[PDB]
Amino acid sequence: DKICLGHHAVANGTIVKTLTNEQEEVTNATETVESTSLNRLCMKGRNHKDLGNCHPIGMLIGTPACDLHLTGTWDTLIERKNAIAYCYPGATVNEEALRQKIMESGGISKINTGFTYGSSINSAGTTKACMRNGGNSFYAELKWLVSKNKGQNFPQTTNTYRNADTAEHLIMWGIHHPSSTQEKNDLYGTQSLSISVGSSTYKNNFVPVVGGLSRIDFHWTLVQPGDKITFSHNGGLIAPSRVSKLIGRGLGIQSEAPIDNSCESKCFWRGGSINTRLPFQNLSPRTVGQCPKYVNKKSLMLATGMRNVPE
Amino acid sequence: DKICLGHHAVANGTIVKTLTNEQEEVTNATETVESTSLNRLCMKGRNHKDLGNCHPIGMLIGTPACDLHLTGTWDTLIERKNAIAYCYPGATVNEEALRQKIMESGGISKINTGFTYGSSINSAGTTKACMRNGGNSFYAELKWLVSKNKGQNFPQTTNTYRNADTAEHLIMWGIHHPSSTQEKNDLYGTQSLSISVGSSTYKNNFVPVVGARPQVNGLSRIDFHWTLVQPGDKITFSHNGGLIAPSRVSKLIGRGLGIQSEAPIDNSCESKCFWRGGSINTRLPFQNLSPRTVGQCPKYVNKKSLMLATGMRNVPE
Amino acid sequence: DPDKICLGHHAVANGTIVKTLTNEQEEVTNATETVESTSLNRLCMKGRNHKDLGNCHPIGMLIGTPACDLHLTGTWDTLIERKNAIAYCYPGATVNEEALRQKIMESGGISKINTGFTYGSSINSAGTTKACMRNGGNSFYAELKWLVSKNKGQNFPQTTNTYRNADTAEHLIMWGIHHPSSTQEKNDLYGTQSLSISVGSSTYKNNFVPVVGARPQVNGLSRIDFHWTLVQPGDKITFSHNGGLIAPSRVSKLIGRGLGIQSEAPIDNSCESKCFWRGGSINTRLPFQNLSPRTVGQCPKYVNKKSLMLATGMRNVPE
Amino acid sequence: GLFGAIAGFIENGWEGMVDGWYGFRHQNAQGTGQAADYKSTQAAIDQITGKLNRIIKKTNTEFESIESEFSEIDHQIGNVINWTKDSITDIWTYQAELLVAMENQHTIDMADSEMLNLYERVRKQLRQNAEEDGKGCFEIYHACDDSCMESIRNNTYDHSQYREEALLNRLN
Amino acid sequence: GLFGAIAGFIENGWEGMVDGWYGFRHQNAQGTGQAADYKSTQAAIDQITGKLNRIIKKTNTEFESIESEFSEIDHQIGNVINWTKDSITDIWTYQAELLVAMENQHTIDMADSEMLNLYERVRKQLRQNAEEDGKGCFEIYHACDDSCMESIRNNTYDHSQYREEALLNRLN
Amino acid sequence: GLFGAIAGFIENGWEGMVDGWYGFRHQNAQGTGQAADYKSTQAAIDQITGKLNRIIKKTNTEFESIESEFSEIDHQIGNVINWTKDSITDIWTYQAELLVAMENQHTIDMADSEMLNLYERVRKQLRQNAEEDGKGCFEIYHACDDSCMESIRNNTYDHSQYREEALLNRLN
Ligand SMILES: *[C@@H]1O[C@H](CO)[C@@H](O[C@@H]2O[C@H](CO)[C@@H](O)[C@H](O)[C@H]2NC(C)=O)[C@H](O)[C@H]1NC(C)=O
Ligand SMILES: *[C@@H]1O[C@H](CO)[C@@H](O)[C@H](O)[C@H]1NC(C)=O
Ligand SMILES: *[C@@H]1O[C@H](CO)[C@@H](O)[C@H](O)[C@H]1NC(C)=O
């Protein structure tokens, strides 16, 4: 009589790597590197905002493209390719820092600056470049200040905004650099133009320069609770009508992929979502959110069983 | 007759994690993540400087709070919260890069500029904002230059500092931006003001701005600028009103450990690891106090505790 | 009385010490090093089409400094920069200097394409300076032209110069902006008119105003702000100006990819390698290396350890 | 392997064994049979489950964009970002390779050990009533019916019962 | 566990053994005893001490500040620094978790192996004068007084001295 | 060691065995001799070659210069680069130290296990014809000439032909 001890096996086993052996056969194994991506942004459980044609900077200054996105709250913000920040030609100083700061936020609210100007200032100047409601308009949160009577000197004006909130506010402004000397004199007169912005945490001076629409370069800063920021100008300033408060935190995603409210994900990239449970990932080094780690590896099989010894 | 083999056990076992079990009981275990800190800067065996009320930039321009910190050597420099850099209203361009350079240093030495001025210039301008010894004073390393006669035009002046040293020197200066046109005329005169600063490696031009936007208690402001004068090179200040000119230039000596912290000094303990809240003296390899430390430290980890087993499996009963 | 058979293992008189998880002084029969400690202190260029720049600086080869006359064009897979390399003969500074140097060092060759700018009779283009000496006489940057008025004092004419990218590969274009030392100098070269220089295209768009006394004076000479950008295939770049521009006579294209090696150590075609550093070269099969943390190529990882011995044998239990 | 049983003194596995990882095959006068051992099987599965619970997991650290997808980044800071990202990736690629190679080696030897621990508790149960054949079997020197074979598997085989009969057959 | 002794064929540990990690308990005519094995106890402790010497340790690399506690920093380079630091923190947190888990596994299994190696040493000493009961004990088939027991512990037991007597008692 | 053989019950290695890692020494009436075991020697060597193939290797990732050797980099960027380079070096130095310490521990324990495996293989072959002396030898209780010794070394020794003679010698 006999009793024999033994172990199971399978006909078709799986190859794994060990410390010792490249080609070790085992009864079962499982993948640790995810290779597939969903070609969409999985937005289930997320109060998201798809900006579409609106560029994040554009919702602070207020281009026509961003009229639906001037305020709101979100936990996720999606930026698309070729989104419009500027109707009238321009460039923001520290463009990328401002974009990323907006794309880290979980909302925007707008606060009136309350700025008032004398009778010799026309504040309602528009342009055919910023079209809204099939008519000439301008950036919704700014005002182009000009001399009311064409040719006259713009008066030395002082406008000061105080932050009365318990949170910091983001304030923007433009500086019109005229194209020719004729335009400069028609808009602001023949005087020396001197624009001066200043607070506790910020101070700068801007002198417009001469030399087919012209430029408007944008600037920005944060204004801390209880602090004032003061604009001293005599022509050239594109003054704010409202300031912005960035509310809480959120996840900025840059992707052309469509939104799907049926799937959930915590990790995103340019080409969509990566909602695997696996620890590793070979799809992209550029991701955001809570992600598996990128590895230069096609497959990596963890063994879930003994050696397979068939016969 | 029996002889039985066996192992020890304890009543009070301790839980650890293994490759295959989250809740494995063992006879003994030791912690690997440090959770506690000394609320003290352990400065034994260090030639240290506690700046206290003095901001690093204040050491170069000579603010009243920084009078004890104008020269020296150190291997460790402690900066504090809300430290003063300016007695008179103003700021420095490229401010944070300057503070970083000073906190990287192991000392400051001061060399005279040797700047002389013509008889129509009063170089001893003071103000009640920079009080010192119960009397109106000014930034100790700079001079507020004004006209001797109230109203007269400030003369077209030139000043050249040459670097005789074999290492680079840090030269600072200021530009006065007056409050009213009355001030601008009383000190510098009615002429248009040009200030020019030029070397082999630097050039810029400055124009005072009368009626500056940011003010406090009916006062003007004074903005500081800086650059490095290379060995042998000359730097020339051309000005006719509004320059705040350097009496001395600075030389940063070697290297030291900059610390930003709130905690008080203790000369009785050593330490090689520092953070906002104090010193970390643990022998443990990991740490969960802060991701922001300096010196030779245990690595930060997102873990309250991680127990290393120092004993066998605990099998009671 | 009874016979017997005994099991056993080999051993050696002197074993080697290695470190294990539990023992710092564990003796084994044999072991092998995993951290490379020896460097061949010469640049190993056996299987490499190399270019030793010598005195030439990479930026110098785009603008055409006298030091970079030999290296104005060519192809390579490896480019060797040296210490104290000359970029500028006439005092100058390039915007994004380090970026432009890295692009030239990442490339595998440069070829130069004529921009073909012509200028009117009232413009003097072929003016030279003694700061850039060439062949024992006064010269200038070969790939640039200092434009001034023909007659001293007279105003510089409003000139337009356009370059179209005729190639399928993108071209790199450079130009200077002269900010005069004095009003006297401005008038002598460009006249009394207020100066303005415009550069425009699809890719790049920027405007430059020359100003009196804006830049430093190295030996009494005004320092030139060099700028640069890329013209895409098919696209035009338009220089519109009226005095102050130092315009290109030639453009550059970056041929493919290559390996930049900054190293003052001597060259040697006897030795071969795939990994380099300032001190020399690192030829090794080992996974780790303690010569330098700043290497280039396909390199072993840098560790702060002299030696790490990997056991290739059992415990040595000698007799 | 390390413990000498699986791909060792056991010549091969049993494809017919589908209700367990380790088990018994007997033969006596009544015929033959097969049965899976629950505890040794479950001991090996539980350790692999625990191994999977640790490894099939990601960090809950929220990362954000430092490279714009739709615009140019500064050439200086971009080369720093790329070099950093590539350095991190080489570390994780290395760390993942080593993790799985190490875990795989341990898994194999761990399963090898549970086979041996099953074999060893049987040897000690049988005591002087059987002898090892070198192939994983125990030749039992007494009549051991289906109820006797059950008690070896159930861990209630009393060696005292069959000791006298067995010692005589072994000596002969 | 891997070697099958601790939390294996030895049912449990002894709270009363407070002068050693491993040891003996015996029964004979005289009465009972207990003693610890010094060598095996020390072999385990020495190996654990080795781990603590390697692990409880930091690097001597001097890191300087790249983040201001009291002033603002450039937002773009601040984001790169946050990304780099959080990436490094994820690496070290993973390395710590793995290290301790891998060492805890090896500690527990090393302890188990020393227990088995002691048992195996004692089995070979006793040779044919005793048999294994499956619980970590050896039933000795002769009178073994305290001097005899001590000889098993101190490794001086000659099997020749009791072989004839023991083989008679075993065969019965 | 883990498996109790090398630096365990085997008291020392044999410096004279130059043609293999593991082997046999015999003693019979005709004399004594020595021979290496090929199969267990290659088992150990093949596993070490496997470690070397995996470890003596470099990543195909090509790295480019971010710091300039011959000119001054920006102050704030350099600090970030320096902090990140020292952090990466600390990670790799730790990984390198851990890799080799872990690998060395496994190598010597693996080699130990191969010794035990050969010993257990021989133990099960000889069956009841021999007894363990506790030092890696088996005392064979019958006459075993040079070709009988070779059958043990060649794994073709049939216990049953010598079983009657051996059992008589063991009881007497
Ligand atoms: C880098 O990370 C730090 C720490 O997470 C950020 O600073 C915190 O920001 C939150 C708001 O998101 C504040 O409520 C905390 O008070 C800040 N903590 C500290 C210790 O400063 C910082 O904002 C991040 N940097 C950037 C550029 O986004
Ligand atoms: C083997 O692993 C696969 C996943 O790779 C799984 O689907 C399957 O259920 C496993 N087999 C079992 C548990 O028998
Ligand atoms: C074990 O625990 C004791 C206290 O019960 C402690 O003093 C000792 O340091 C621990 N052992 C080790 C090796 O850490």
Ligand SMILES: *[C@@H]1O[C@H](CO)[C@@H](O)[C@H](O)[C@H]1NC(C)=O
């Ligand atoms: C040790 O092993 C290496 C390979 O790792 C081998 O080349 C060398 O000859 C061995 N050393 C000795 C002394 O045999």
Ligand SMILES: *[C@@H]1O[C@H](CO)[C@@H](O)[C@H](O)[C@H]1NC(C)=O
């Ligand atoms: C960074 O890497 C990406 C792809 O690997 C590449 O497109 C980009 O040009 C790189 N950045 C720099 C500055 O070379």
Ligand SMILES: *[C@@H]1O[C@H](CO)[C@@H](O)[C@H](O)[C@H]1NC(C)=O
């Ligand atoms: C970075 O480290 C090097 C030495 O490794 C040192 O010379 C240099 O000053 C450091 N860079 C900065 C910006 O401090």
Ligand SMILES: [Ca+2]
């Ligand atoms: Ca952030």
